[PDB]
Amino acid sequence: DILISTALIPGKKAPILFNKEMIESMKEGSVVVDLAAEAGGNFETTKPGEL
């Protein structure tokens, strides 16, 4: 039910570890946390300045 993405390689861009429909593949009410927000993010869709 909860998903926290904190994956990031230092010095290069963080790999997108979540897809476009695999992110919507959770239930309606999912929580996707992207803790690599300054270095891009581990999702296929993540605006890094707003929830």
Query: Known binding site: residues?
Result: 8
Closer Cβ to a second copy, 21 or 31, answer by number? 31
Residues forming the annotated binding site for NAD(+)?
Answer: 8
# residues near a second copy by CB under 8 A: 3
Considering only CA atoms, which of 3, 51, 49, 50 is closest in space to residue 26? 3
Per-residue x/- marks for a second copy, 12-51, CB under 8 A? ---------------xxx----------------------
